[PDB]
Amino acid sequence: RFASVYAWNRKRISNCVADYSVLYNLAPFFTFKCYGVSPTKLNDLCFTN
Amino acid sequence: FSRLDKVEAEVQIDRLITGRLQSLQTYVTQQLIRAAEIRASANLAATKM
């Protein structure tokens, strides 16, 4: 389930393997778009938060 | 080059290249002015000697 717009749910993800390949290909994903980085090369940069 | 898709990052890199290029030309122009004034001083010193 999902919460309300003013009650937007928030979570933090840490200490795992940033494998976006399994998700990006699956599902039609009608709208998907990134801002500061290319949505095609997520898999070669390391994050902290 | 490692974060932006290359079909779009050319705008940013061209802006940065133009900025650095302008800075380098500014340095060259200042060097020309100072070299001219030093040549004038050197001619004066040669006349003195």
- Residue A16 contacts residue A38 (beta carbons within 8 Å): no
- Residue B6 contacts residue A40 (beta carbons within 8 Å): no
- Alpha-carbon distances, residue A3 vs A6, A11, A12, A23, A27 (angstroms): 8, 13, 17, 22, 22
* Interatomic CA distance for residues B34 and B26, integer angstroms: 13
Q: Which among A34, A37, A18, A29 has a CA at the least distance from the CA of B12?
A: A37
Chain A residues whose C-beta is within 8 A of a chain B C-beta are 36-41, 44-45
* Interatomic CA distance for residues B8 and A38, integer angstroms: 9
Cα dihedral value A12, A18, A20, A23, nearest 10: -60
How far does A12 lie from chain B, in Å, by closest CA? 22
Q: Which of A34, A35, A38, A40 is the best mutation test for B, with the most CBs of B within 10 A?
A: A38
Exposure string over A23-43, b if 16+ CB within 10 A, otherwise e: eeeeeeeeeeeeeeeeeeebe
Place of tokens 């009608």: A30
Residue type, B35: A
